[PDB]
Amino acid sequence: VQRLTYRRRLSYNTASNKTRLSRTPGNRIVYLYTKKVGKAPKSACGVCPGRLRGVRAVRPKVLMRLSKTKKHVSRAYGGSMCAKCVRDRIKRAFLIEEQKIVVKVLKAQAQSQK
Amino acid sequence: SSHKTFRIKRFLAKKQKQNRPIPQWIWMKTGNKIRYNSKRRHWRRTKLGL
RNA sequence: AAAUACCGGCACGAGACCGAUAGUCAACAAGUACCGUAAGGGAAAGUUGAAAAGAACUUUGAAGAGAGAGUUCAAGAGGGCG
RNA sequence: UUAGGACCCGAAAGAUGGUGAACUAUGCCUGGGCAGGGCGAAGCCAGAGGAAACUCUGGUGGAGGUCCGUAGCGGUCCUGACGUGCGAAUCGGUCGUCCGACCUGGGUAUAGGGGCGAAAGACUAAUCGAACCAUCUAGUAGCUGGUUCCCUCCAAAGUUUCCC
RNA sequence: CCGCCGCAGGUGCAGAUCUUGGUGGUAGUAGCAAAUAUUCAAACGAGAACUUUGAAGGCCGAAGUGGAGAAGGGUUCCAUGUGAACAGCAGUUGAACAUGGGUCAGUCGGUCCUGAGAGAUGGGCGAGCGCCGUUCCGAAGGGACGGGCGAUGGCCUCCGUUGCCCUCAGCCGAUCGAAAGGGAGUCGGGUUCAGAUCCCCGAAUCCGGAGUGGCGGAGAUGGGCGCCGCGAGGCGUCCAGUGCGGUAACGCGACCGAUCCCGGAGAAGCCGGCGGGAGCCCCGGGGAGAGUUCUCUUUUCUUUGUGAAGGGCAGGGCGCCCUGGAAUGGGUUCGCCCCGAGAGAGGGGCCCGUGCCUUGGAAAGCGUCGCGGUUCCGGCGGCGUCCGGUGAGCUCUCGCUGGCCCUUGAAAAUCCGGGGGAGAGGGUGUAAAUCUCGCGCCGGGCCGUACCCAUAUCCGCAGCAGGUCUCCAAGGUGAACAGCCUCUGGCAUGUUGGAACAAUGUAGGUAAGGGAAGUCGGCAAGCCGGAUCCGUAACUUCGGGAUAAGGAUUGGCUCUAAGGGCUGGCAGCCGACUUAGAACUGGUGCGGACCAGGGGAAUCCGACUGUUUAAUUAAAACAAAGCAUCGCGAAGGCCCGCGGCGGGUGUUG
RNA sequence: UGACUCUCUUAAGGUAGCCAAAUGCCUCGUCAUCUAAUUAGUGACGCGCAUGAAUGGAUGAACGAGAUUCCCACUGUCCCUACCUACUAUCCAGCGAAACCACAGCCAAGGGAACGGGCUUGGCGGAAUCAGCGGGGAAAGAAGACCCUGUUGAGCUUGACUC
RNA sequence: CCAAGCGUUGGAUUGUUCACCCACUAAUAGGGAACGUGAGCUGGGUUUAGACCGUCGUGAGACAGGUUAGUUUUACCCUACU
RNA sequence: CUGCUUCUGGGUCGGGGUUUCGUACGUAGCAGAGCAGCUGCUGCGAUCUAUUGAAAGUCAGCCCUCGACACAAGGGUUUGU
RNA sequence: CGACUCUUAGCGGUGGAUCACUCGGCUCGUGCGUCGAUGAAGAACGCAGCUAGCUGCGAGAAUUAAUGUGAAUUGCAGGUUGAUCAUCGACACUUCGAACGCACUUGCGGCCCCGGGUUCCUCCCGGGGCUACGCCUGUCUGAGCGUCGCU
Structure with missing residues (x-):
């Protein structure tokens, strides 16, 4: 039964030195040294425990090769922030900026009776 | 070892x-x-130093 | 400046000195071989003959080793051999 | 008779300036590693018995400087083997621990009256109640040991006084 | 070389466990006894217990005596010759000796980064070599977008390289520090006596570069108007154009943009349970070649390929998204868990796919059977390389989910997305600036690469039973990575043989009857031992004690029943392992070897786990939680330094 | 015996507890228990030489390669030895050390530096050897680690002396 | 009294020589031989280094006062004996 | 301690005797818990019974052969009053 | 007769004393009294037809040029218009080293200038020269609510 060796000098089971079983066209099993499991970008908001959508989960120096559209979603804060926390901050941007006008108009109509 | 430096490999070569x-x-x-x-x-017998 | 010092250095001259277990650790491929992780520790080892003339040749042996022959004043000097 | 290496050999020491954490001690950094079983913590489910309060029952779950036990790591007893050894500490059987105050490789920090020490004056390169190297140093010794030709002539003392 | 007369001394040896060298007796003595083992023929050769080949018998038995590495070694590698020395017997053999040979990279490492740390400068200290210190007592930036004034190369075209000066800049420490951390990107087949992810062939891939960019595609070729002409088309003008689709999640091949700001990836522990996908093993067939065939065996054994990068599809995952409004609460896991902050049910979206299919690709590999070139060959050929099923299987890997912590489990290089919108671009065109889209062109230096990697290439003076970091891990028995036996691979018994079979040993056994009477002492040995079914005391901190104690059972055979998938309260088809009950049966033997707890009643000490005198002491010692004092509010407590506006606790209160 | 009382020594006079304990000199303490027999063990007894409360006292499940006594089971530990097996030793071919060694190597007594291989006096004494063996060689080992001395040190201590 | 020919034991506790005791016996007499006998063993006790207790000392430490853990080497020479 | 030709002697092998163990393989059976498959025959089945005190070993340091089969008058070194 | 053992002698071994030699020390004396950024001492690694070491030397590498000298060198080959030796003044002198671009890997550059890849054209390739610290004299450039000055 096929017992098979490390192919590199690194003779330790470290995160760099990780392999998988690969049957070749020579009808023999040999270690191919696997790439690491990439992570999708986590949200810029900081209340979303899950990772983003529409962005490739890949090791971060590979991102040079990826096309622009593989790295973002087509939206305001695309590939940076989640859809949930954007549209709650479109509300928060608005209802605060409205509340500014509510006290702005009251400011003069709290002054004008004196 | 297998992993040598150019200065040590020159020392061994001499x-x-x-x-x-x-x-x-x-x-x-x-x-x-x-x-x-x-x-x-x-x-x-004699181990060359190093 | 001079008179003065000089166990290092570069040249030399000499001796009531030592004679290879002596005299420097070292007369020689000696601060060499070797040892210690390192600092450092640190040896042993001169002489064939006048001249290699270093033993052609033949012979037994698997050879190492011999037996005759030969070289030399000398192998009773045979390549760590006055 | 002295002072000097001072007739030759010899201390335990002391001082000075250096080299060591490749072993080991401890902290740090970055890696690797650890069968198969027992016990069954909370949480949870359903059922039973009751008036609630609740008291049970059988499952589930998979806790623990938890247990048996392998590799690992150690090293109890035989006071076995060996004891001019395989070995300047090994061998065999039997043993301690084996999810954690765990084991371990590199890297890195601490250096000699100092280091580090779950503390034994243990460990610090087969060296430790003060490592090793070179020098001061031929240290000093009222104490041991030795102190090399011949013949000839003379020939003792172990008592007095004083003395760390 | 010496006599006599003087002169001078390193001037006389038996001793000093004297110093150096040499040689004895012991003595052809002790010894050549750790890990089961050799045997037969033959070959070469002067010569064979040892070499080689063949056949046999054995061993390691996948936690190996196997196949590869890291440290270290440094030629030990490989071939050929040699037999003096060395290899503790021998040698035709060797890691010996002597002649030559051997390590090929953009992709594997180093290089790059920072970690703990190390360490210049400034400053401070110091008699001084220096030391401290690493952001601190410092004028610590030699970088870029913009604008005239000029020099320049190409028809100075208008731009590249600049010169002079305006506006912009913090992120805060030179440098060093990992061949196991981070860290873009190479794989298949073949080839050597010794080298291959490195050479050859064939497939790619990464990064950087391009001066007038080598071509495409995108940008980006729209919409109103006023004329001819059956109608299309037509000739002119206005304005528009930094891309589009989906309710959304987000998708499509591009899809302008600076100083700046924000963020992400790099970049996070151990452990448990469960799932997905591989590798291997297993089950039922079919081939191909072997082995057995005295008898039985549709037999037993071997073998039955498809790389990277693409594309598509599974299959996983989702703490994404729309509908809708949920109690008679419901969905759902092994456990959980989930929900009016939006469940169920329905419909989409994304990510990962290492699986599968496909380009690669059958042309190669392998299995075979057959022909040539006697030899010079990746030789030309023919057949096959198949169809399935299982699973709490083991190993790796991916995901989901919970536990644990007075433990919270790295930094940087490098890389990316966004937010802004300063700018930039062309005026209907040969459109422009611009493109993270498809292809094309060039380039990738330097160093390491052999071999051993341990009962013989390392370190213990040695081929030393010691020590020394990992990866891969078959079949049976079994709870098992235990032990025992076997396959692949490896070996020749561990620095010798032969002949005997005495004492004394060393290492295993067994003993009638008694049974600790032995002895300091049950030391050593022995008993017990696995599983299933009953049963389990004192004491207790209620957890334990506990496998307490004490019993019964166990083989082989042959049935019975029970426990499930899958298609249309029942049929149809596929089960894969376990449990219980039973009969029969042997000379009562059965956990048959192997593996594998003697038990009880007390006392002393230390709670426990842990640690300790490496090499005579593993304990009652040390530690430990807990308890209790003591100091100190920082110009401080405690402590270091030769020194200092020094340093540790202190990234502390 | 001394709850009560007084007194002395520079302060208090050992309280709760525990005990011939790992702590008790006497001592093999006395009593009970275990045995046929127990300087052992366990349980008591306390005028305890010289127990005692974080120099911690008493206790105590679980735990222990810790130290003890007993009981059951099992046994060559023994009565009392015997046999077998493997590797040695043994003999042989090949190879081949070492420690040690004044010269050496048979005793009885005597005397002697008071325990002789040698001397004296008697016993006596026969080549060269092999396998064993532990009586002797006051056997080898290593300038006694005990002890004492030295105007020799070192580690440590403190109320030594000097800083 | 002649007399050492021949015997003089098995055990509980004790490291013990000594002692005491149970039981047998013909009897359970005393001794020597470097207080026989460690290259014969054993290592219980003493008498290293680790630890604990008590008393003692200001302390380091002391204690024929308890307690526990604690490396037992070599013959192949010559003799003697076999 | 023995043997190595009285035409015989030892050796070897065979056979006897002895003795150890406990009933061989094959084969047969209306024996066998049964079960499967064929309409009572046919498979599978531990085991049991018969053959069968069978089979196997038995001097290497057991006993007797007179049966096969070779072999056996040799070599070496020494020794004189 | 023995073997064996001892003593003596002859011879032969083992061994390396003795004696005799001495291109070496040791000691005293004399004359000189000279290293280095123009890269020292020291170290590393190379260099010979056949060469390991020693010595010699440095990619011009057991030496080059010049000078003197006048036929060798030599283990073996091989090939006077100066062989070879000494002398040494000219030239040359790899890497590390005070050690110098920054590091110590032989790892990374920065700038100017040449030649290939060209058709100065910016990467790439090779070559060349600079690129350390402390400091003196001057030079240039900017600094300061330093002390003033004039506008």
């Missing part, structure tokens, strides 16, 4: 070329006093 016997035309000279090579350096 100590190989010094580890050869005398030429047998050297003892036919006039003022000849050399029988064998006294500084011959075996790899079990």
